[PDB]
Design a protein around this nucleic acid. Structure first.
Ligand SMILES: Nc1ncnc2c1ncn2[C@@H]1O[C@H](COP(=O)(O)OP(=O)(O)O)[C@@H](O)[C@H]1O
Ligand SMILES: Nc1ncnc2c1ncn2[C@@H]1O[C@H](COP(=O)(O)OP(=O)(O)O)[C@@H](O)[C@H]1O
Ligand SMILES: [K+]
Ligand SMILES: [Mg+2]
Ligand SMILES: [Mg+2]
Lengths: 368, 366
DNA sequence: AGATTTTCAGATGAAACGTAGGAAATTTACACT
DNA sequence: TGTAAATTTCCTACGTTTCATCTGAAAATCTAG
């Protein structure tokens, strides 16, 4: 009942429970970078909501404070870039780095990718620089993404790189070069029930108001999440629902939690579609009234026409679909029928009925 | 327990390669011209897996690189690890100091840029292509002819091809064989005795005091000697053996540990394989499990049963008759074509792997 | 017995299938000079 | 002139299903003295 903690933890929390070792080992490797000119690269692996992102922001964020105070750090530049948020593309990523490191005048298109690395050297020419790459599992999955990192990690301009991926098997996606010249991987083990109950008890302490939360209920949520799951972002945001709701009196009982849960699983789908590139939505409706992909594409080319907008190639369409399946919105079938003319791509809309409601709602609110 | 297991990873490269004395001779002799800057003869190496092929070559080239010190380039490229005609030609065009964009070019125009890199390169160069099997398997033979025609259609580079089966020499219809079998070495599988030498010379760098009984090594060797004289088996079997006697926190190794290793190794070989199996192939296998010394018929039968209990349309018996054989190659099932007068012509089918490892992983996917 | 004729139960071959998907070509948006 | 990424244009080879042809020794039938 004092929201400041629940959307900007990095401002409240001056420490990260159960990640102390991670945090220390880093500030060590960095002090050895500044005082020893010794490069280092690490790969933060872990499931979602295990503090990967949070930790990093904190290292970065505290070091911003450190060079202010210290002075021997005065001369160190930092860049924090989110390979997913930008494009996922090498070009997109390299541009951003060269943005902060150099100064910030930088092209996004037209330039030869090498002249980004050339640009970065010039902006840190002796002067030490640190790199953070959240969700580098995007960059890697794209052509030449590891072939970029390799030329980063193992180039001249003394630069230390931190890579936080969300996909764990992200090594099998990485070329020998890269993996070989890579530093140690640091794995964020998901939290257990006890760990969660403490974390929550911290958030409860700061954001909420004494009395409204007992001890069993904190125990309750941690029990829920923790058990094959891990994930702290849910755990925290889960409290928030049962919090919202329990503004009644209020005491917060097992109810408030249960609802908060359905409230969360189904509410997800809503914005999960709200924020869905324009044609994707049109494509998505195509599917709800025909699972046949070639057939859907026709009622797609229809809605485009009706909204004076160029319909995309069926190839690009089948992709947007394939891609919608990577999203967990639809499910592709592929039925093969030998002499009976087989090979048809199909797509199932998970709920069909829920999604439609959300699609309608979204189109409608975006007119008033 | 150890003091460097790294001396046991299929990376490390030793001072000497015992018993590959003739193979080394024959190569560095048939590569000699490089010293006066003169294109050598193309070599074609075949032998089973773990017979030294990759080892010898990577080592002979590191020796000539120093003996000659002479201008001389070699690029070792693993067709397996590359898995794409683009990537192969993209490194080949990187090793010659040439820059290619990640996208924008296309095979055809890629060979074009490559013929330029050669006629502009003043250093005789040897190209190593390991496990060509892989990259001729699920790609085209083409790369060969087009690489043959390449030094040929402008006057030079030299090649070394390393594959695994005799059957591969058959795929070389064009001058591809005529111009590669110029020199053709064979890497016979190792002897158990040979395999003991190889293990001992690498063990004394790896372990600790008398942490490792002689007796362990002789059987570690004779185990792998029984499964196609494989040198990489003999090494894993040993390393793991050590790692196992490590988690069992004691500072020695026991024969009991090696048999232990062997199984453990299967588990993971198969678990990996089984995980990357077509939903439908996982399916045929599953039935064979619930049946446990049966006939293709009974298999398709219990196959339809699970498609039914699962709501997932079946597949032709025709696809299942081969999906079986396919699991034979992977070494999960064993199926033989028996001939029994009035009991017909079936595949006697049975499990090669353990039953548990086959299901725990099986479930790991669904 | 020995010499046949079936008879079983599946192997092995081959064709027909029509788009899903991979690779080239074009377009988009820029940049530098 | 250029480059990197997004989309369009081309074209077949992919995983099967269907149709058609083989297989090979067991057993059940016949053979004739
Ligand atoms: N140990 C922790 N202490 C405090 N808050 C945490 C902790 N772990 C997770 N959180 C909260 O949950 C969110 C999820 O963690 P996050 O930084 O997203 O890691 P990831 O990038 O792996 O998802 C964080 O942004 C933070 O608000
Ligand atoms: N004669 C040998 N001496 C030492 N090690 C060997 C010998 N033959 C093979 N090996 C080892 O086997 C491992 C992989 O074998 P490798 O030669 O790559 O087999 P292949 O290349 O035939 O698949 C390497 O670690 C290498 O040390
Ligand atoms: K077309
Ligand atoms: Mg994250
Ligand atoms: Mg090899």
């Amino acid at each position: 009942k004092n929201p400041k903690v629940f959307i900007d933890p990095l401002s409240v929390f001056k420490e990260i429970p159960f990640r102390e070792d991670i945090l220390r080992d880093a500030a060590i490797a960095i002090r050895y970078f500044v005082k020893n000119e010794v490069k280092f690269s690490n790969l933060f692996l872990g499931l979602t909501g295990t503090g990967k992102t949070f930790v990093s922001k904190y290292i970065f964020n505290e070091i911003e404070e450190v060079k202010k105070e210290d002075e021997e750090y005065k001369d160190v530049k930092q860049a924090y870039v989110n390979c997913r948020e930008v494009g996922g593309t090498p070009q997109a990523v390299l541009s951003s780095l060269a943005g902060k490191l150099t100064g910030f005048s930088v092209p996004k298109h037209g330039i030869n990718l090498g002249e980004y690395i050339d640009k970065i050297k010039n902006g840190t020419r002796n002067i030490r620089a640190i790199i953070y790459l959240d969700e580098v599992d995007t960059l890697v999955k794209r052509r030449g993404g590891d072939i970029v990192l390799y030329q980063l990690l193992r180039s001249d301009a003394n630069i230390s790189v931190i890579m936080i991926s969300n996909d764990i098997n992200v090594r099998d996606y990485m070329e020998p070069r890269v993996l070989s010249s890579l530093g140690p991987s640091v794995i964020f083990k998901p939290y257990d029930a006890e760990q969660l109950k403490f974390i929550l008890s911290k958030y409860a302490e700061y954001g909420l108001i004494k009395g409204t939360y007992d001890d069993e209920i904190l125990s309750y949520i941690a029990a829920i999440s923790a058990k094959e799951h891990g994930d702290a972002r849910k755990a925290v945001n889960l409290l928030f629902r049962a919090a919202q709701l329990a503004s009644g009196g209020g005491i917060i009982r097992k109810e408030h939690v249960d609802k908060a849960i359905v409230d969360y699983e189904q509410e997800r789908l809503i914005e999960a579609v709200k924020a869905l590139p324009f044609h994707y939505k049109l494509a998505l409706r195509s599917l709800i009234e025909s699972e046949d992909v070639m057939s859907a594409h026709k009622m797609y080319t229809d809605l485009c026409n009706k909204f004076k907008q160029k319909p995309l190639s069926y190839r690009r369409f089948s992709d947007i679909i394939s891609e919608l399946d990577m999203f967990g919105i639809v499910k592709i079938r592929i039925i093969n029928r030998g002499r009976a003319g087989g090979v048809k791509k199909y797509a199932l809309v998970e709920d069909k009925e829920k999604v439609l409601r959300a699609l309608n709602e979204t189109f409608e609110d975006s007119i008033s | 327990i150890f003091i460097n297991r790294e001396y046991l990873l299929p990376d490390y490269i030793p001072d000497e390669l015992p018993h590959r004395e003739d193979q080394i001779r024959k190569i560095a002799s048939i590569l000699a011209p490089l010293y006066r800057e003169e294109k050598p003869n193309n070599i074609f190496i075949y032998g089973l897996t773990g017979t030294g092929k990759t080892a010898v070559v990577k080592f002979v080239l590191s020796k000539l690189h120093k003996k000659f010190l002479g201008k001389f380039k070699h690029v070792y490229i693993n067709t397996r690890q590359i898995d794409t005609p683009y990537r192969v030609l993209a490194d080949l065009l990187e090793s010659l100091d040439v820059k290619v964009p990640f996208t924008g070019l296309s095979i055809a125009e890629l060979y074009r840029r490559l013929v330029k890199a050669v006629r502009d390169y003043g250093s005789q160069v040897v190209i190593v292509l390991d496990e060509i099997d892989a990259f001729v398997k699920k790609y085209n033979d083409d790369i060969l002819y087009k690489l043959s025609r390449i030094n040929s259609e402008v006057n030079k580079i030299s090649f070394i091809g390393i594959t695994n089966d005799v059957k591969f020499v058959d795929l070389l219809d064009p001058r591809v064989k005529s111009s590669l079998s110029e020199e053709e070495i064979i890497f016979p599988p190792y002897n158990a005795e040979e395999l003991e030498d190889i293990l001992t010379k690498r063990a004394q760098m790896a372990f600790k005091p008398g942490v490792l009984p002689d007796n362990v090594i002789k059987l570690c060797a004779a185990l792998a000697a029984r499964e196609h004289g494989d040198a990489r088996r003999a090494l894993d079997l040993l390393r793991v053996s050590g790692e196992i006697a490590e988690r069992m926190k004691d500072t020695k190794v026991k024969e009991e540990y090696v048999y232990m290793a062997k199984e453990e190794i299967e588990r993971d070989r198969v678990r990996d394989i089984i995980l990357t199996l077509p939903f439908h192939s996982k399916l045929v296998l599953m039935a064979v499990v619930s049946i446990s010394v049966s006939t293709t018929g009974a298999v398709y039968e219990t196959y339809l049963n699970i498609c039914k209990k699962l709501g997932v349309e079946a597949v032709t018996q025709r696809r299942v008759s081969d999906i079986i054989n396919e699991l034979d190659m992977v070494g999960i099932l064993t199926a033989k074509v028996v001939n029994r007068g009035r009991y017909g012509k079936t595949k006697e089918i049975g499990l090669a792997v353990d039953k548990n490892i086959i299901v725990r992983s099986l479930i790991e996917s669904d």
